[PDB]
Design a protein around this ligand. Structure first.
Ligand code: CDL
Ligand code: CDL
Ligand code: PC1
Ligand code: 3PE
Ligand code: 3PE
Ligand code: LMT
Ligand code: LMT
Ligand code: LMT
Ligand code: LMT
Lengths: 178, 126, 56, 459, 63, 55, 55, 99, 55, 88, 170
């Protein structure tokens, strides 16, 4: 969620993702921890026996056959962590994640109930306004010549500079907002 | 064994032969696609984080989609034998079918009332 | 009262005067249609002691 | 009626002789007071309908339509103020005069006792309506919308004029009461069948009937909000009101002449309600929703039963308040982000909690939640159509399912889900905007409390 | 939102409560007319065919 | 899930309305006491409507 | 239906017909010779109708 | 290009007048427009209009008709007459065709 | 209405204590660590299954 | 509800706690900055299980794109702290 | 009150009671508490209200309409005569609606009153509802939204001519 994906997954990335899925669906079948631990070790041994395959073309074929095997032995209803995509609590608190720019419409009688909070908020707004022009210039300066581009953003190189495009990350609502 | 895709149950990526292709022609396409996405993402974020923005962010893709599904329809319509046959069947077909359902039913109901074998017992409101 | 005040608040007589005038015209419409006053089958009767008309 | 019409005419000098800073406060306030006076028409202690003069009358069909017309004028004024606040003073006064003109014309239209008088006022309304759409609409398609609206009406209205002259040449009068009492059976000739269509088409185009409805989605998407309010609430009801008045002289040909129009309406109401599921434009969605509702009004007037006329009268009033409310609700988001695309603004319940409540009640009214007058009208229409032919319930049943689907679809899409948080210009709801919603919804609830007032002529 | 709800309630109660008191006071101390046979030779007025004091008062003075 | 509940119960509501229209036309009532005198009638159409509503 | 065939058959065919009739009747050369020839046709037609309808 | 104004910028109505009611940029005009709508719309029309409608007597002669029905039901039953007859018009008042 | 409402209450008692976890594969041993909720859960299950003389 | 809020020191203790129970790590040479591959000599398959044990410990998932970059216990601690809005 | 002749109610027949057990009946004690705490103060308020009413006693009258000539006696095209006859017919039609409502009200009250005996003890109310419904259908069924005295008369004459034809063939 924090890192953007690359253009393509390397062969190693695809194998390690199948390994994590395979164990997790095994855990859903086994349920009991002792049974899962037994079969988790048997599962690792199968990934190890072909760890040092240097053919590549055979390694890619071994990945194909494992993925086909995974789909047939897939658990129909795998365990999902409650806050994960498809979990029971997924997006449960989105109706409470009010963006910070809503406070700009608060009435003065509303703001007067938090005199200290709205003084600090002014400092964060002043900090944001001063840094913007430098942030834009840095991204313009650091553009590569060849068109190949990615979603990764640079850090602040100089001193007193903030990393470009930080406001929507730093000031985002809390996971448990209220 | 084996999974057979359907239009409403599609093929997983892990089972897709085109996900395991590493030819430099494909990898160049994949890199080119990400460059488009990354440039679009940068343009969006520069608008999004700009502290002088006072209004929402215009979305040209959404305007194109809503335009394509309304104003752009008729100029790009061509009467063809398939259009014309479909238009006539969809437009008039149900009208004719329902005419005979209601007409046939109401003719029978009147026929029974004239000759007394329609049981109107307590029906006083209509 | 004051030309600045009156030049601003005199317009508040227009609609009320339209209502009063509209009511006056509606009573004139009643007067033109008295050809069956106290002459219908349903309602005609003898006039009460000091009564000139059954409705006006 | 003169004690209602004359004060309405005095709103025009009041508009033009007011100071720039007092115009809106003045005209709105007296417009409310004129709505109060129209309630005198509800003082009906007998079964003889009010004939004020040779020219103006009021009975249980026109009385609700006159009062609803009088109520809409203040509401339209409040709706217009925010988007007119950049126009200069003379342009604001010109707009108000157009709104008053419709109010005057429509009140006279619903109280006219003579059919060519009805026709002249019926046609006169096009002028202020066209001006509102084309001078104050926002997009370049407002000019095409003006052409469709004007000429869909006019092509149907010319045959109506011929039929009215023909009836008068034959009977000697177009007075409605005398036409009622002296009506005699028509022969089922080809000439009389064309007479039936000439008498009916203009009212059917105005409803609009499915097939000739394309003018209405165009007119709503392009009109300003006060134009949408009057068009959906009152102007469509001229067709239904016209059909009920004139069908008294058309018997017995309506028994077979109605079949194509019952079929278009009962099938058409499914086509237009199903369009609402895949409509990207919120105003267009509400407009297609009206076409679906007015299809029911057409069907029930065509079958001419006591229940069918009563269900049509209630639905006419209920749809008038409900659809006007929906246009106002949609316009409040548009005035903030200036788009009618439904899927653009989302999760708005997060930031406009009370406006979301108004959204929910408008949506619940629209899908006919009992005991609302919305449901009562649709229910009695369903009962009368089932009596007409038991197979009508199949098409009724499909439309009821689809109506719930798009009504809740609009709420879920716009009010729920995650907030589209790039929209930092979502200013809090105006007092005026929240008041406008309440002025729609309180009468709907009050009429649900006392539904005898909108039963019409047959009950 | 809270300002609007406060204002709407204030302006409904401003006249609404007095009307509720007045209706209650009329219904306790005046009450509705009781049905009586028309005396012979008597022509009632139109407002004597209604029960409620409010309805008779509006009928008498305005209709 | 919220719209799913609306949809399925709206499909059931068609049967409820079917029973309502049938009883107002054949008994002139929606009151249960007057509907009890439908005991001898053939009630297949309205009872199929209630069953769909219940389903 | 709504965006294509209801448009094509009612408002759009009406527009096409009267535009077509407008261009066929207003595309005049401005030559007095041609108009006077057409007035001769008008005169002959009126004389023919009078002759055949002569009792 | 031609000579044309740029599009105006989005404005926050509450920035200058945080007590904005939606009616006018002038604060005093704004609050009095708000009061007139609430007073005439709600205090007058909705309250008194509701009251006036509530006390319209015998609306469309519904109270008289039930009162008249009970009188007739009472009369028609003590005297043994049918409650309601099939013929609205006495047949003696009708002259049918000979055929 | 009695034992089913209790069953939902007792599961809501468990779901709440285990940090909004609803999957039974991440529960277990509730009979010892939540004695009160477990006892009512068993009472409700025995009533559902027709244990004699329960509701 | 009844659970205490997480803390930076509390997360760190439980992250090192889980690693001390991994037989392929000697507890003594483990510090917050111990790189799993270089300093500790674990392969990539091992790092998948370390993350899977972290998700079980704290009861939330780490997406694969983010998990593949967590190569020392301090990275894991930082990730959990930013996910759960821990700041002190 | 109301007319016991228009809205008849059978006399009540309530048993003794004859309690066997020695336990106290909670309903009996709750009713006594209710009759003191609730019923008694409410009666005093009502009696005060009725005392005020008698000091301001006003009366209202049921309106009487004299009969006017029927539609049968109107020359066609005579709008003045048709109007009065038509208005008379609308008044009668309305009163017929309320007579139907009274008969249905008796039927519903009797069904509830008879309970498990309704299939036997509601015979008279069910027969009156059947007769009065037949008579209603003959006057008014199929007139349509524009029902009137002229259409009712045309419907009657059509039925009379068919009855006469059937009798003549007999
Ligand atoms: O010739 C004149 C007329 C002729 O008498 P008539 O010929 O024997 O009457 C029979 C005619 O057929 C009927 O007479 P007509 O044919 O000549 O018609 C005229 C009559 C017709 O009368 C009607 O029946 C029309 C009914 C219209 C519907 C009204 C709905 C209810 C109105 C409630 C208003 C709120 C009241 C609170 C104030 O209108 C009136 O005379 C005046 C009626 C009031 C209309 C104006 C209402 C708006 C002003 C109130 C709102 C202002 C609030 C804002 C204030 C603050 C501003 C900052 O005489 C009268 O004016 C009435 C008789 C005098 C009675 C005085 C009673 C005391 C004053 C009470 C004032 C409150 C009025 C409440 C009215 C509620 C029921 C209508
Ligand atoms: C020992 C001594 C100590 C005792 C301990 C205390 C015991 C307390 C006793 C509690 C019981 C009090 C009952 C009482 O006195 O009230 C009777 C008192 C007198 O009325 P009533 O003689 O029993 O019968 C009224 C008539 O039938 C005529 O009714 P109406 O049509 O004129 O008004 C009713 C109508 C209300 O009137 C309206 O419909 C007009 C609504 C417009 C409102 C617009 C404002 C916004 O309701 C509509 O649904 O009732 C009222 O006036 C309440 C009016 C408000 C209606 C609430 C519903
Ligand atoms: C919204 C609805 C609002 C409802 C408000 C209900 C208020 C009811 C007011 C009636 C109060 C009557 C109290 C009472 O009993 O005594 C009144 C008292 C009467 O006292 P009394 O009621 O105790 O009299 C006892 C009975 N007699 C007289 C027969 C012995 O009224 C007076 O003030 C004296 C004048 C009489
Ligand atoms: C014969 C005529 C009989 C009817 C006379 C009705 C009374 C008319 C006078 C009412 C207006 C009173 C004066 C006025 O203009 O109101 C002032 C108000 C605020 O204006 P402002 O410039 O801001 O001054 C600030 C003062 N604190 O500005 C306003 O908002 C006032 C709003 C006026 C709305 C119309 C009033 C209708 C009154 C009921 C009509 C009764 C008939
Ligand atoms: C739900 C909570 C109840 C809230 C309303 C309570 C107010 C009230 O007292 O109304 C009761 C009264 C019922 O009276 P009734 O119809 O006779 O009942 C049947 C026989 N008992 O009902 C009424 O008489 C009030 C009826 C409402 C009157 C409307 C007031 C003005 C409306 C403004 C115009 C806008 C509407 C435009 C369309 C109108 C069409 C006529
Ligand atoms: C529910 C409402 C029902 C809507 C109507 C449904 C029926 C639709 C089928 C209509 C069939 C006639 O379809 C007809 O096809 C021809 C094929 O070229 C179109 O013809 C098109 O090209 C020709 C050239 O050849 C042009 O002259 C013409 O103006 C253009 O439209 C006609 O314009 C169209 O009218
Ligand atoms: C039987 C009852 C119903 C009968 C009703 C008949 C309604 C007839 C309405 C005629 C409409 C006139 O509409 C006039 O022509 C067409 C309509 O397509 C519009 O034309 C529009 O679409 C065309 C393509 O079709 C574009 O190329 C053009 O730029 C655009 O303006 C005109 O802008 C409008 O001025
Ligand atoms: C008995 C009469 C009933 C019909 C009523 C009259 C309706 C009007 C129909 C004729 C006029 C509409 O004419 C129809 O629309 C416009 C003109 O407005 C033309 O459309 C044209 O508009 C403009 C102006 O020329 C151009 O920029 C555009 O590109 C072109 O499409 C259509 O090609 C024509 O078909
Ligand atoms: C829409 C808003 C409506 C506002 C409503 C305001 C209505 C005000 C109600 C006033 C009711 C009282 O009205 C008054 O009642 C008295 C009862 O003493 C009646 O008065 C009549 O009968 C009484 C009975 O004792 C006699 O003593 C008296 O001489 C006679 O005139 C009349 O009816 C009226 O004079």
């Amino acid at each position: 969620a924090f890192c953007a994906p690359p253009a393509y997954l390397t062969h190693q990335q695809k194998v390690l993702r199948l390994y994590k899925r395979a164990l997790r669906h095994l855990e859903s079948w086994c349920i009991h921890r002792d049974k899962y631990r037994y079969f988790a070790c048997l599962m690792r041994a199968r990934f190890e026996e072909h760890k040092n395959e240097k053919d590549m073309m055979r390694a890619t074929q071994l990945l194909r056959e494992a993925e086909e095997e995974f789909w047939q032995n897939q658990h129909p209803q795998p365990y999902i962590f409650p806050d994960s995509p498809g979990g029971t609590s997924f997006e449960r608190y989105e109706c409470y994640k009010v963006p910070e720019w809503c406070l700009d419409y608060w009435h003065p009688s509303e703001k007067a109930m938090y005199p200290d909070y709205f003084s600090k908020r002014e400092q964060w707004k002043k900090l944001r306004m001063e840094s913007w022009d430098r942030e834009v210039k840095q991204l313009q300066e650091e553009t590569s010549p060849d068109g190949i581009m990615t979603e990764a953003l640079p850090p602040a190189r100089r001193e007193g500079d903030l990393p470009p495009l930080w406001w929507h990350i730093v000031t985002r609502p809390r996971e448990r907002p209220t | 064994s084996k999974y057979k895709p359907a239009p409403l149950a599609t093929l997983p990526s892990t089972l897709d032969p085109a996900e395991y292709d590493v030819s430099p022609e494909t990898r160049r396409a994949q890199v080119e696609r990400l460059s488009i996405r990354a440039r679009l993402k940068r343009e969006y974020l520069l608008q999004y984080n700009d502290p002088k923005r006072v209004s929402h962010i215009e979305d040209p893709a959404l305007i194109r989609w809503t335009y394509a599904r309304s104003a752009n329809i008729y100029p790009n319509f061509r009467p063809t034998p398939k259009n014309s046959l479909l238009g006539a069947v969809a437009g008039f077909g149900p009208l004719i079918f329902w005419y005979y359902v209601f007409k046939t039913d109401r003719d029978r109901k009147e026929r029974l009332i004239q000759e007394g074998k329609l049981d109107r017992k307590f029906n006083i409101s209509y | 009262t004051l030309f600045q005040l009156l030049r601003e608040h005199w317009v508040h007589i227009l609609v009320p005067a339209g209502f009063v005038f509209g009511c006056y015209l509606d009573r004139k419409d009643d007067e033109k249609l008295t050809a069956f006053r106290n002459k219908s089958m349903l309602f005609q009767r003898e006039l009460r002691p000091n009564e000139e008309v059954t409705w006006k | 009626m003169l004690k209602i019409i004359l004060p309405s005419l005095m709103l025009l000098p009041l508009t033009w002789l007011s100071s720039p800073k007092k115009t809106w406060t003045n005209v709105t306030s007296y417009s409310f007071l004129i709505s109060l006076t129209s309630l005198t028409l509800l003082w009906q202690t007998d079964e003889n309908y009010k004939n004020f003069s040779n020219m103006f009358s009021s009975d249980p069909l026109s009385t609700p339509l006159i009062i609803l017309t009088a109520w809409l004028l203040p509401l339209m004024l409040m709706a217009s103020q925010n988007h007119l606040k950049k126009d200069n003073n003379v342009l604001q006064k010109l707009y108000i005069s157009m709104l008053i003109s419709l109010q005057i014309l429509l009140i006279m239209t619903f109280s006219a006792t003579e059919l060519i008088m009805f026709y002249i006022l019926f046609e006169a309304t096009l002028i202020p309506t066209l001006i509102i759409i084309t001078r104050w609409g926002n997009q370049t398609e407002r000019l095409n919308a003006g052409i469709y609206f004007l000429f869909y009406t006019l092509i149907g209205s010319i045959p109506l004029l011929i039929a009215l002259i023909l009836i008068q040449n034959h009977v000697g009068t177009l007075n409605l009461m005398i036409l009622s009492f002296t009506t005699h059976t028509l022969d089922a000739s080809w000439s009389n069948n064309l007479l039936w269509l000439a008498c009916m088409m203009a009212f059917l185009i105005k409803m609009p009937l499915y097939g000739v409805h394309l003018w209405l989605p165009k007119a709503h998407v392009e009109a300003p909000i006060a134009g949408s309010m009057i068009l959906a609430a009152i102007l469509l009801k001229l067709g239904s009101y016209g059909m009920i008045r004139i069908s008294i002289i058309l018997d017995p040909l309506t028994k077979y002449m109605a079949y194509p129009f019952i079929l278009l309406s009962l099938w058409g109401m499914i086509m237009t309600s199903s369009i609402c599921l895949r409509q990207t434009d919120l105003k267009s969605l509400i407009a297609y929703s009206s076409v679906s509702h007015m299809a029911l009004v057409i069907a029930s007037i065509m079958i001419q039963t006591p229940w069918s006329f009563m269900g049509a009268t209630m639905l006419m009033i209920a749809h008038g308040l409900t659809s006007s409310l929906l246009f106002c609700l949609a316009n409040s988001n548009y005035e903030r982000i200036h788009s009618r695309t439904m899927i653009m603004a989302r999760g708005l319940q997060m930031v406009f909690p009370l406006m979301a409540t108004w959204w929910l009640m408008a949506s619940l009214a629209n899908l006919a939640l009992p005991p609302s007058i919305n449901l009562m009208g649709e229910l009695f229409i369903t009962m009368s159509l089932f009596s007409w032919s038991n197979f009508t319930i199949i098409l009724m049943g499909i439309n009821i399912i689809i109506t719930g689907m798009y009504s809740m679809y609009m709420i879920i899409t716009t009010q729920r889900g995650k907030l589209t948080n790039h929209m930092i210009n979502l200013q809090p709801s105006h007092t005026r905007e929240l008041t406008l919603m309440a002025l729609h919804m309180i009468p709907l609830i009050l009429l649900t409390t006392s539904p005898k007032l909108i039963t019409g002529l047959t009950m | 939102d809270a300002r609007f709800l406060r204002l709407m309630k204030f302006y409904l109660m401003l006249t609404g409560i007095p009307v509720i008191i007045g209706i209650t006071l009329v219904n306790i101390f005046i009450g509705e007319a009781e049905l009586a046979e028309i005396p012979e030779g008597y022509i009632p007025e139109h407002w004597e065919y209604y029960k409620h004091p409010i309805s008779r008062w509006i009928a008498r003075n305005f209709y | 899930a919220a719209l799913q509940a609306i949809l399925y119960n709206r499909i059931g509501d068609i049967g409820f309305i079917l029973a309502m229209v049938w009883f107002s036309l054949n008994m002139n009532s929606w009151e249960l006491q007057q509907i009890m005198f439908s005991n001898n009638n053939d009630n297949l159409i309205p009872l199929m409507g209630l069953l769909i509503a219940a389903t | 239906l709504d965006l294509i065939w209801l448009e094509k058959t009612i408002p759009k065919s009406t527009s096409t017909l009267h535009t077509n009739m407008t261009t066929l009747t207003t595309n005049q050369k401005g030559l007095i010779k041609l108009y006077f020839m057409s007035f001769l046709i008008n005169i002959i037609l009126i004389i023919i109708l009078y002759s055949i309808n002569l009792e | 290009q031609w000579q044309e104004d740029p599009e105006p910028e989005d404005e926050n109505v509450y920035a200058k007048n945080p007590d904005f009611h939606g009616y006018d940029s002038d604060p005093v005009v704004d609050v009095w427009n708000m009061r007139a709508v609430f007073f005439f719309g709600f205090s007058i029309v909705l309250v008194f209009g509701t009251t006036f409608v509530a006390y319209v007597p015998d609306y469309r002669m519904q109270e008289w008709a039930r009162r008249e029905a009970e009188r007739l039901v009472k009369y028609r039953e003590v005297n043994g007459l049918p409650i309601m007859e099939s013929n609205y018009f006495d047949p003696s008042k009708i002259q049918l065709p000979e055929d | 209405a009695f034992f089913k409402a209790m069953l939902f209450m007792c599961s809501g008692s468990i779901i709440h204590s285990l940090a909004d976890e609803q999957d039974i594969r991440k529960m277990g041993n509730i009979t010892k660590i939540m004695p009160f909720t477990s006892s009512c859960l068993v009472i409700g299950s025995l009533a559902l299954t027709g244990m004699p003389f329960l509701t | 509800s009844d659970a205490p809020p997480l803390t930076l020191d509390g997360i760190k203790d439980r992250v090192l706690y889980v690693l001390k129970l991994y037989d392929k790590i000697d507890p003594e040479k483990l510090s917050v900055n111990s790189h799993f591959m270089k300093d500790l000599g674990l392969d990539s398959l091992d790092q998948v299980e370390i993350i899977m044990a972290m998700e079980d410990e704290f009861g939330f998932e780490i997406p694969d794109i983010d998990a593949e970059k967590l190569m020392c216990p301090q990275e894991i601690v930082d990730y959990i702290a930013d996910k759960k809005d821990v700041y002190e | 009150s109301w007319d016991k002749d228009v809205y008849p109610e059978p006399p009540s027949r309530t048993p003794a009671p004859s309690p066997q057990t020695s336990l106290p009946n909670p309903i009996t004690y709750l009713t006594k508490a209710y009759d003191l705490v609730v019923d008694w103060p409410v009666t005093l308020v009502r009696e005060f209200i009725e005392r005020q009413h008698a000091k301001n006693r006003t009366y209202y009258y049921h309106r009487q309409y004299r009969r006017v000539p029927d539609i049968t006696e109107c020359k066609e095209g005579d709008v003045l005569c048709i109007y009065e006859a038509e208005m008379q017919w609308r008044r009668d039609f309305k009163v017929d609606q309320e007579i139907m409502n009274i008969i249905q009200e008796r039927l519903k009250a009797c069904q509830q009153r008879e309970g498990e005996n309704y299939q036997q003890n509601c015979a008279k109310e069910l027969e009156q509802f059947t007769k009065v419904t037949k008579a209603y259908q003959d006057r008014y069924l199929d007139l349509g939204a524009y029902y009137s005295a002229r259409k009712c008369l045309a419907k009657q004459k059509q039925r009379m001519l068919e009855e006469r034809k059937a009798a003549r063939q007999e």
